[PDB]
Amino acid sequence: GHTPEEALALLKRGAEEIVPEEELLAKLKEGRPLTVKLGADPTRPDLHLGHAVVLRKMRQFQELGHKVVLIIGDFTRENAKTYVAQAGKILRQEPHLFELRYNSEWLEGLTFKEVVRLTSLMTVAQMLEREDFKKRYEAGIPISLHELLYPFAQAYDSVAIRADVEMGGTDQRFNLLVGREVQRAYGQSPQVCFLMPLLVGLDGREKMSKSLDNYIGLTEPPEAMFKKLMRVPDPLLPSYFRLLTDLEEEEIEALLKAGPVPAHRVLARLLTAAYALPQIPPRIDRAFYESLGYAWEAFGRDKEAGPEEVRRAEARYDEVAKEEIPEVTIPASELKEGRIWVARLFTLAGLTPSNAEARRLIQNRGLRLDGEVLTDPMLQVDLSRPRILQRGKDRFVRVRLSD
Amino acid sequence: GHTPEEALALLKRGAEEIVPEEELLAKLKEGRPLTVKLGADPTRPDLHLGHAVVLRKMRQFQELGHKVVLIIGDFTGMITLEETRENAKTYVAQAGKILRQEPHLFELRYNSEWLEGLTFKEVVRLTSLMTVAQMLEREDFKKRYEAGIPISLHELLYPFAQAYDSVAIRADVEMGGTDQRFNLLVGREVQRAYGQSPQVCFLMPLLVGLDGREKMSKSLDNYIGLTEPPEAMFKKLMRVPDPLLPSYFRLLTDLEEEEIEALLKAGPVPAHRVLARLLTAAYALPQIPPRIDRAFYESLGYAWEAFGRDKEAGPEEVRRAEARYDEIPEVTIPASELKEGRIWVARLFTLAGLTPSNAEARRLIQNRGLRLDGEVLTDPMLQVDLSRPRILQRGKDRFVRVRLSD
Ligand SMILES: N[C@H](CO)Cc1ccc(O)cc1
Numbered sequence A: 001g002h003t004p005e006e007a008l009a010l011l012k013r014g015a016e017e018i019v020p021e022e023e024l025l026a027k028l029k030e031g032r033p034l035t036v037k038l039g040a041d042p043t044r045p046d047l048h049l050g051h052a053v054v055l056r057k058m059r060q061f062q063e064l065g066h067k068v069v070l071i072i073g074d075f076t077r078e079n080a081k082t083y084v085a086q087a088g089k090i091l092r093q094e095p096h097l098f099e100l101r102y103n104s105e106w107l108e109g110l111t112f113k114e115v116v117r118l119t120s121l122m123t124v125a126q127m128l129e130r131e132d133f134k135k136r137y138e139a140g141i142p143i144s145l146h147e148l149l150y151p152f153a154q155a156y157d158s159v160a161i162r163a164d165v166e167m168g169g170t171d172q173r174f175n176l177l178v179g180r181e182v183q184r185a186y187g188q189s190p191q192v193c194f195l196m197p198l199l200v201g202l203d204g205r206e207k208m209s210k211s212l213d214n215y216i217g218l219t220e221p222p223e224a225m226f227k228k229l230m231r232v233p234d235p236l237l238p239s240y241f242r243l244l245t246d247l248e249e250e251e252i253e254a255l256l257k258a259g260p261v262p263a264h265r266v267l268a269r270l271l272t273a274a275y276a277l278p279q280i281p282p283r284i285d286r287a288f289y290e291s292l293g294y295a296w297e298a299f300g301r302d303k304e305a306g307p308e309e310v311r312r313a314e315a316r317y318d319e320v321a322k323e324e325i326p327e328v329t330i331p332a333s334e335l336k337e338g339r340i341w342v343a344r345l346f347t348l349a350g351l352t353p354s355n356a357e358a359r360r361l362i363q364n365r366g367l368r369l370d371g372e373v374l375t376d377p378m379l380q381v382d383l384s385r386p387r388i389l390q391r392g393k394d395r396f397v398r399v400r401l402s403d
Numbered sequence B: 001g002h003t004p005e006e007a008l009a010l011l012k013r014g015a016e017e018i019v020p021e022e023e024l025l026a027k028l029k030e031g032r033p034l035t036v037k038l039g040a041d042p043t044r045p046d047l048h049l050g051h052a053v054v055l056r057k058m059r060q061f062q063e064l065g066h067k068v069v070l071i072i073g074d075f076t077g078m079i080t081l082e083e084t085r086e087n088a089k090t091y092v093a094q095a096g097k098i099l100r101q102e103p104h105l106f107e108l109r110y111n112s113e114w115l116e117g118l119t120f121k122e123v124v125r126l127t128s129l130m131t132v133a134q135m136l137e138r139e140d141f142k143k144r145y146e147a148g149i150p151i152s153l154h155e156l157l158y159p160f161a162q163a164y165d166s167v168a169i170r171a172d173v174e175m176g177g178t179d180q181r182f183n184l185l186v187g188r189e190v191q192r193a194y195g196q197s198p199q200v201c202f203l204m205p206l207l208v209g210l211d212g213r214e215k216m217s218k219s220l221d222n223y224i225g226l227t228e229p230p231e232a233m234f235k236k237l238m239r240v241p242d243p244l245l246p247s248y249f250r251l252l253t254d255l256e257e258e259e260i261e262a263l264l265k266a267g268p269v270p271a272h273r274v275l276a277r278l279l280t281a282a283y284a285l286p287q288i289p290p291r292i293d294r295a296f297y298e299s300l301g302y303a304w305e306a307f308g309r310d311k312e313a314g315p316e317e318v319r320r321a322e323a324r325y326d327e328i329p330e331v332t333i334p335a336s337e338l339k340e341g342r343i344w345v346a347r348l349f350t351l352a353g354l355t356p357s358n359a360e361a362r363r364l365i366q367n368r369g370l371r372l373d374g375e376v377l378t379d380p381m382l383q384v385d386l387s388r389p390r391i392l393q394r395g396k397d398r399f400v401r402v403r404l405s406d
């Protein structure tokens, strides 16, 4: 239900660079399923939101009728299964739209004479042009010669599967272009290079990555993902919405205009819900948001709505939602049907030596709960949210559930 | 009949650099034949004296009981199988003039035998042994990269191919010209990575050509081929630039330093004769002797004492070839001087400046004092044509070339 022009317009959204764009248009006009290539290194099995940027663009190609070929760069079986298992949360898996390949399948048989021919397609000066190599070579940092061979292995993969398009982050620009040169050498139409921007991590400056521990895994439990999303740096909200969701620009502005907290809740709800599912919907947009049960015009104030898995994750967040004031976590086993005796609470926090003493202080108006003078010695409190306990004029302790 | 120390001393003669020299001595004490490697380019089958420098050092290794493994670099060469094989035969045939050929001391191999099958995985492990900065240190690469001259990336794979060849045949020593230094050293690093003792790198100087400036090579036409006719070889050796004599004696013969210094003290020509005789004879044989020294010189029937002058002795070809080896004014005659393409011989000599008048020319002819093209003139009225340049001669030292306009 899309013309070639319409398909291109959709694919361009969020794209960093498509080279050459006019070639993609021509291929989309052919009326056949294009082969979209993505290679992944087995040493990084677990996926995080950063990987979702490129993968969701591939899901879009699939929904448009195109075929994805996921190449595991084993050149293992365990990580492959982990990566493949998680990739399915975003990519469709039917044979007509998805194929799994291991490059050892054809690379292991590549001969020395073939390698000589491949490397002859580039000059030393060209290779040292690649950004990473250039910084290293000028900094006196060693570059093992075998490293210059890898772009040719990745390029040969494009020849092996006759790739029409190859996906990648902006850091993969050089390798994808080598793919075009190698395909030409083998008499194939050179692949369209499709680059997506890199998602910045939770620290707010560096690329999201396992090695930097600034990520959010696709398979982390809902409560943990929701919590992390609620804590993304405000400056990153704009890029997270553009790269992780399909919300329109005006919808994103409206959310921001509503404020930081509302924007975080909508982002946390959208993504926690999407990734809690076996597979994400083809569009993480306003319609999806309302299909969950939330109201767009409520701008995050309707926390009781939504599916139970997301609702509970948000409730867990509100229980611990956060410096001189001492913090103490209360064991869940201390609660009786969601509530706990205020006397016991003051004793556990160390403000009173026993419940009897707590009752005495209450009778003397010496204790406060959330800044309110306690008067009911038998009062029972819930920990749906952190509570500040106070004894006298200068003793404060903030208590909350599970740490 | 040599101790390890004696062996090393002989092998050191003429060498430009042996590294590590202590390792060669160590291997020479192991009481086993060492594998001495030489790689050859199948696109350069014709051999000249320049190749003899490294090949004769290898012959010395053979005479000491060591084994030569000659490797034809057909892998890179074919990157047709017909010419490869033909050239290999050409190279081997000519190399046999210097190298012993029996199995115990010689083995021929083609590196395609093992390189064709090297897997991409093995190539990756191989190239991980050196950095980009390291590679760019090789003579040519460095100059080219700094200047901006293109270097195809595949060129950086060749040193590893040559290095793997040393691993393939477990080389104890690899021979080469001074220009092959970088490649031989990579071979050591690769052998180390493959659990082998690193090969000793044996470098020889590069023989300079007949021009006296550039290295001897086919593409420069300043070479002397090993299979050239004894006559053609003797003549070229007599023409070796004087400054090169010492290096020719040291790199092509085994004459002692004193013998050489004594030969030079005798003069250029004398020195050239001994050299031309020694090499002309040696290379006219089906295979050269183990030592091209005084003993060989005398076994030819020459006297070390007559220093070159002993010119009438020695073998036939040599003595003869040496014999075969052992500015004339021009005057144009205007067509006006001719009559139906002919002129009076008397006037010709006068116009040439060999006689003051035609009358004198006539008297000289009568006294047999004049020659025409080497023949004694006997007719004073002789009519001569200039169908081609003629050589006029008076007495034994007065010559003149006469011809028409041109
Ligand atoms: N260039 C990256 C290597 O790990 C990703 C990759 C891309 C394509 C491939 O065929 C293989 C790997």
Ligand SMILES: N[C@H](CO)Cc1ccc(O)cc1
Pocket: B038, B039, B040, B041, B071, B072, B073, B111, B158, B161, B162, B163, B165, B166, B180, B183
């Ligand atoms: N170094 C020259 C070309 O690479 C010749 C050569 C030397 C050693 C070999 O195993 C092969 C070729």
